[PDB]
């Protein structure tokens, strides 16, 4: 039997946030934990939930898995409807990409001895930005099989070669001592609507009128700001008439652009005043004494 590149690691919405929260809190320590879930078939590894391991002490590296902590948490999670086996482990790489070092390879061999399809997921909480999390799932290449002249896994599809390996990972042993498993995310309608509540302002704020003394003062200041910008904007028009096309951008570097700031001031004021007017007009009928 040979592993397939079509294999996918499915991380739930809950499991993704816990690794990011634990990984960011533990910066720069390679804070590790266990990934609970279920090996659905030979091509799916589901990560329903994860739980973080304590740090035994100081040191930016992956510590050994504490069997008592693992046994006690697994035993207690079964009491709250979490009877899912450990399908691997996760650890954080705070800013230097997602790969496995020498210590991580030994840590993964411990899991592969118990479960042959265990997955080592690496999360980069520092390099992860909004809408794009730097995550990767790795499983070791047996040196005996690859040295003899066999590919670590068979290729029966395109699914395993859609993501181009990074140079940082290829430097640190990717496709030599471990291989990457494509990661998909299990998101349901309920969990998506729940997260949409983030930064959702209260209904009071929509009808709340900004302080009129400060609104006039802000209108006062910004209109005065455009007074100088308009004076500078006239100079920019004459200057750019007699400017070589190589200086259309170089000469704009380090010097403030009157046109650009004029648009920002116009955009801010027109959003500010229209909302203040519209909200005020709405409140005159909604909150009416008659």
């Amino acid at each position: 039997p040979a592993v397939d590149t079509a294999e996918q690691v499915y991380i739930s919405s809950l499991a993704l946030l816990k690794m990011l929260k634990h990984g960011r809190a533990g910066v720069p320590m390679e804070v590790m934990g266990l990934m609970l879930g279920e090996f659905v078939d030979d091509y799916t590894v589901r990560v329903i939930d994860v739980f973080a391991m304590p740090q035994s002490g100081t040191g930016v590296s992956v510590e050994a898995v504490d069997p008592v902590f693992q046994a006690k948490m697994l035993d207690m999670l079964k009491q709250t409807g979490r009877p899912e086996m450990v399908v691997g482990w996760y650890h954080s790489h705070p800013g230097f990409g997602c790969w496995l070092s020498g210590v991580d390879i030994n840590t993964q061999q411990s899991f592969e001895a118990l479960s042959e399809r265990a997955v080592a997921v690496v999360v980069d909480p520092i390099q992860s930005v909004k809408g794009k999390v730097v995550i990767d799932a790795f499983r070791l290449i047996n040196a005996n099989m690859m040295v003899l002249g066999h590919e670590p896994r068979q290729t029966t599809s395109n699914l395993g070669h859609l993501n181009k390996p990074s140079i940082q990972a290829l430097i640190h042993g990717l496709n030599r001592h471990y291989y990457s498993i494509t990661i998909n995310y299990r998101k349901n309608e309920l969990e998506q609507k729940m997260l949409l509540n983030l930064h959702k302002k209260s209904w009071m704020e929509g009808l709340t009128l900004q302080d009129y003394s400060e609104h006039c003062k802000h209108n006062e200041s910004v209109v005065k700001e455009m007074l100088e910008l308009a004076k500078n904007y006239n100079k920019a028009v004459e200057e750019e008439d007699k400017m070589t096309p190589e200086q259309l951008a170089i000469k704009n570097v380090g010097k403030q652009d009157p046109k650009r700031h004029l648009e920002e001031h116009v955009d801010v004021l027109m959003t500010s005043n229209i909302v203040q007017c519209l909200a005020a007009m709405l409140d005159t009928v909604v909150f009416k004494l008659i």
């Binding site: 039997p1 040979a2 590919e151 068979q154 290729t155 029966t156």
Partner: protein, 136 residues
């Protein structure tokens, strides 16, 4: 196609020496079946038997299945033709070949399984391996 089989085996060989991976290996086998589809000519597979043996797991499934593409329209004898290529029973890694033979057989009788349906229906019924059920 048999009589007018003006295939160019120099093109296939020039890419056989450029095969270094399993993906490039299975590509040539699918390529081989394409240039010889309906020509009933497995000359490339006959003269490169030790090279074809490098295929493992589903590449064996694809390689055995390539026979049906080559022998498409060979209604005259296909059960004996496939059994000639494939022994009845084999222990090591024969599920991919046995399953591939069944799906090669359907490739021979594509849209024309007048009487091979009963054979494929029996083998799928008396099938234990998941791979053989896949080819069947």
């Amino acid at each position: 196609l048999i009589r007018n089989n003006n295939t160019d085996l120099m093109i296939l060989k020039n890419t056989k020496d450029a095969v270094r991976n399993s993906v490039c290996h299975t590509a040539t086998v699918i390529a081989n079946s394409f240039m010889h589809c309906g020509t009933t000519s497995d000359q490339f597979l006959r003269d490169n038997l030790e090279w074809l043996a490098r295929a493992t797991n589903w590449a064996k499934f694809t390689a055995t299945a390539s026979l049906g593409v080559i022998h498409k329209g060979h209604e005259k004898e296909a059960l004996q033709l496939m059994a000639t290529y494939l022994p009845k029973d084999t222990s090591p890694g024969s599920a991919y070949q046995e399953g591939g033979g069944l799906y090669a057989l359907g490739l021979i009788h594509a849209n024309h399984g007048g009487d091979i349906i009963d054979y494929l229906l029996n083998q799928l019924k008396n099938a234990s391996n998941d791979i053989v059920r896949h080819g069947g």
